[PDB]
Design a binder for this molecule. Structure first.
Ligand SMILES: O=C([C@H](CNS(=O)(=O)c1ccc2cc(Cl)ccc2c1)NCC1CCN(c2ccncc2)CC1)N1CCS(=O)(=O)CC1
Ligand SMILES: [Ca+2]
Lengths: 235, 51
């Protein structure tokens, strides 16, 4: 998260961090239920073996309420490839059930139609993670959250140097220095509708971090909603 | 009908049952008695910041 704001106590419960053998935070993720984590599809390349942490707002200080879970199975989207980055979405099933508490709750999965017209048409959106403070900078210790505006689907394709499929979408700023970055990837993008949050999108990619004339590219959850279910219900 | 008037005065999802508007809620929520607002069955419902 570049710029943005610090998730205070209880604000970003759905947050999820994937950690590597060295217990290092490399990717984000979103809590859907007890044994299901939503993450990017490419984040399943950034490591050999990983666990997913929950209820952590500081990557150094053991604030008591942290907790680690192992991965029991990995559901990566078949129509994926880094050539295009289309279908950047993956569902993780945990070996042991996430027990909810403070700083550890789930994000609602909205209905496709109502989401595509009431959530996505919303002004802003919430993206968060333990990513870098600036493009070529350091990873973050404290968990951050950034309110990124929904960016015109059309002026999304211009600004971009690559194809922008309707399986993904823009969001962020033109000049202002606020965006996601390395590490935030796979994390969550949630819309706040009437005091509750839904899983509107996944942190995917972007030309640099907070670069003028570029927007943050996320995966379209609705575009995969029914896919998401089949994964949890397994298949 | 008119889930676009103000979400059909719902709390979350809103639908149009031909005639009029139909509200509903996400996993872990039960539709209140007025058929609009949503009520959480557990202490840790999806979509809520935990305080
Ligand atoms: O965008 C990057 C990295 C950059 N890393 S970053 O600046 O810290 C960055 C990463 C993700 C963001 C997501 C958002 Cl929402 C906002 C800002 C972001 C900033 N590579 C740059 C681009 C390299 C080529 N790409 C395509 C896409 C389709 N077709 C062809 C090529 C996309 C990413 N990706 C995704 C993470 S990865 O697989 O570990 C490396 C490739
Ligand atoms: Ca910690």
């Amino acid at each position: 998260i570049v710029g943005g704001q610090e998730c205070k106590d209880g604000e970003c419960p759905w947050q999820a961090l994937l950690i590597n053998e060295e217990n290092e935070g490399f990717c984000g993720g979103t809590i859907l239920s007890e044994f299901y984590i939503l993450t990017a599809a490419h984040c399943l390349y950034q490591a050999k073996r990983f666990k997913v942490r929950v209820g952590d707002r500081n990557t150094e200080q053991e604030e008591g309420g942290e907790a680690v879970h192992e991965v029991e199975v990995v559901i990566k989207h078949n129509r994926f490839t880094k050539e295009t980055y289309d279908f950047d979405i993956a569902v993780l099933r945990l070996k042991t059930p996430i027990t909810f508490r403070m700083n550890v709750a789930p994000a609602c999965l909205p209905e496709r139609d109502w989401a595509e017209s009431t959530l996505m048409t919303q002004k802003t959106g919430i993206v968060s993670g333990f990513g870098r403070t600036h493009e070529k900078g350091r990873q973050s210790t404290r968990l951050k959250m950034l309110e990124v505006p929904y960016v015109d689907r059309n002026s999304c394709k211009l600004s971009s140097s690559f194809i922008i499929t309707q399986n993904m979408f823009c969001a962020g700023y033109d000049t202002k220095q606020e965006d996601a970055c390395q590490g935030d990837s796979g994390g969550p993008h949630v819309t706040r509708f009437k005091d509750t949050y839904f899983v509107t999108g996944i942190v995917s990619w972007g030309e640099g971090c907070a670069r003028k004339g570029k927007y943050g590219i996320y995966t379209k959850v609705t575009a995969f909603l029914k896919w998401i279910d089949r994964s949890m219900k397994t298949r | 009908k008119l889930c676009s008037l103000d979400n059909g005065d719902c709390d979350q999802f809103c639908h149009e049952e031909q005639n009029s508007v139909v509200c509903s809620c996400a996993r872990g929520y039960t539709l209140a008695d007025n058929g609009k607002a949503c009520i959480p069955t557990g202490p840790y419902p999806c979509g809520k910041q935990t305080l």
